Amino acid sequence: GFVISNELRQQQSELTSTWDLMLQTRINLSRSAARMMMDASNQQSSAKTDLLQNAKTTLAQAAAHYANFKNMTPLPAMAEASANVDEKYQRYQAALAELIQFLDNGNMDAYFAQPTQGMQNALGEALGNYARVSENLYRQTF
Amino acid sequence: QGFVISNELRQQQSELTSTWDLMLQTRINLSRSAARMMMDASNQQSSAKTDLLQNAKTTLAQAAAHYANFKNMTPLPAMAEASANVDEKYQRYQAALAELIQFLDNGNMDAYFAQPTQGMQNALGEALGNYARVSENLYRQTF
Ligand SMILES: N[C@@H](CC(=O)O)C(=O)O
């Protein structure tokens, strides 16, 4: 709007948007899957459905919020360094989304053994690179 | 002077960011215990091994540690209305979390699953977001 940081809060602290909704979809999936183990009988097994559909929407919302950080970068400068931040986004997005198919489908054993914490971890690392090399940097250089 | 203040706000928004994010990590390792505690209605044993409950214990304590840094930074006066709010909203969202650590610690599956933790959580989000919005609206150095 005004220069950087006006366009950077709405941009990387709007990037903080995607990371909470992707983690949210993680909590919502393992509330869904625990109830799927209840299914052999009913007493509250019932919420499962609702949490899976509404797991799918937080990973949606993440996507769209990501779509502004994309449709907001005409930027680079930090360029291919934080291009990794943009690629591993896609990597976790993809994990979580398979975790929906799997669950959605009935495949619990890959649900449980698909190593989600790692695609996650990478993106922690990746946005966690960006803010460093935004913060100490466009100050030292502009 | 000038600078002083613009730099408390980033340490304070970072201590608050780390509390939130880390209290969220707690949610997910706790779920992962719960989830691996329901196994075939009642499986015989394990499911898997749930260290993950100890993991949730790690992450609660280290959420609560960046919030105890946050509570020892010099209070800007303007702000105090958002912080009172935040601390309410944080203390309760921490009790909520030790309570779920406990219901799991002692195998009370039906009471874990029963607690509205998403509600106390949501309460905190709208609080951190309102401190962050008030901050802009008060000290946004535009230009
Ligand atoms: N109290 C838990 C319920 C569940 O595990 O589904 C939550 O809201 O976090």
Phi, psi (deg, nearest 5) at residue B97: -70, -35
Pocket test for ligand 1, best of B26, B32, B97, B100 (most atoms within 8 A of CB): B100
Window 16-45 of A: residues touching B by CB (8 A cutoff) are 16, 19-20, 23-24, 26-27, 30-31, 33-35, 37-38, 40-41, 44
**Closest partner CB to B35 (pick from A20, A24, A34):** A34
Chains A & B: contacts with CB separation below 8 Å: 52
Phi, psi (deg, nearest 5) at residue A14: -90, -25
CB B131 within 8 A of CB B81: no
In chain B, the residue whose alpha carbon lies closest to the alpha carbon of A40 is B41
- Give the CATH number for residue A80: 1.20.120.30
Given the CA of residue B31, which atom of ligand 1 is nearest to it?
Answer: 5
Report the alpha-carbon distance of residue A117 to residue B66 in Å, rounded: 22
Ligand 1 cavity residues, CB under 6 Å: A 31; B 31, 34, 100, 112-113, 115, 117-118
Report the alpha-carbon distance of residue A18 to residue A61 in Å, rounded: 8
Q: Which residue pairs, CB below 8 angstroms and at least 24 apart, start in B78-83?
A: B78/B134, B78/B138, B78/B139, B79/B131, B79/B134, B79/B135, B79/B138, B81/B134, B82/B127, B82/B130, B82/B131, B82/B134, B82/B135, B83/B131
CA-wise closest residue to B92 among B125, B130, B120: B120
Secondary structure letter of residue B44 according to DSSP? S
Consecutive H or E run containing A5: strand A4-5
Report the alpha-carbon distance of residue B111 to residue A124 in Å, rounded: 32
Report the alpha-carbon distance of residue B45 to residue B56 in Å, rounded: 22
B49: left (phi over 0), alpha (psi -120 to 50) or beta: beta
CA-wise closest residue to A18 among A48, A52, A59, A62: A62
> Using CA positions, which residue lies closest to atom 5 of ligand 1?
B113
> What is the crossing angle of helices B52-70 and B3-35, to 10°?
160
CB A21 within 8 A of CB A65: yes
CB B59 within 8 A of CB B25: yes
In chain A, the residue whose alpha carbon lies closest to the alpha carbon of B27 is A27
CB A11 within 8 A of CB A73: yes
- Judging contacts by C-beta atoms under 8 Å, the chain A residues touching residue B108 are none
Domain span holding position A114: 1-142
**CB-side neighbour CA atoms (13 Å) of B26:** 27
Q: What is the largest CA-CA distance in chain A?
A: 63
Helices (H) and strands (E) in chain B, counts: 5, 0
Read off the tokens for A42.
């009913």
Residues 6+ apart with CB under 8 A from A109: none
What is the b/e burial string over B83-112, where b = at least 16 CB atoms within 10 angstroms of the residue's CB?
bebbeebbeebbebbbebbebbeeeeeeeb
* Helix, strand or coil, per DSSP, at residue B16: helix
CA-wise closest residue to A68 among A135, A22, A2, A7: A7
CA distances from A132 to A75, A125, A129, A137, B65 (A): 16, 11, 5, 8, 22
Residue at token pair 């090399």: A133
- Judging contacts by C-beta atoms under 8 Å, the chain B residues touching residue A30 are 28, 31-32, 34-35
CA distances from B104 to A31, A37, B143 (A): 14, 17, 52
Report the alpha-carbon distance of residue B60 to residue A124 in Å, rounded: 18
In B36-115, alpha helices (H): 52-70, 80-105, 109-114
CA-wise closest residue to B100 among B35, B22, B31, B18: B31
Measured distance between the N- and C-terminal CA atoms of chain B, rounded to whole angstroms = 17
Read off the tokens for A84.
């990794």
Q: Which residue pairs, CB below 8 angstroms and at least 24 apart, start in A39-47?
A: A40/B40, A40/B41, A41/B41, A44/B110, A44/B113, A44/B114
Identify the experimental approach.
Answer: X-ray
CB B117 within 8 A of CB B96: yes
CA-wise closest residue to B69 among B98, B90, B45: B90
CA-wise closest residue to B59 among B21, B25, B15: B25
Total domains in chain B come to 1
Report the alpha-carbon distance of residue B102 to residue A93 in Å, rounded: 32
Read off the tokens for B124.
């905190």
Cα(B6) to centroid(ligand 1), Å: 38
Q: Is B137 within 8 Å of chain A by CB?
A: no
Measured distance between the N- and C-terminal CA atoms of chain A, rounded to whole angstroms = 17
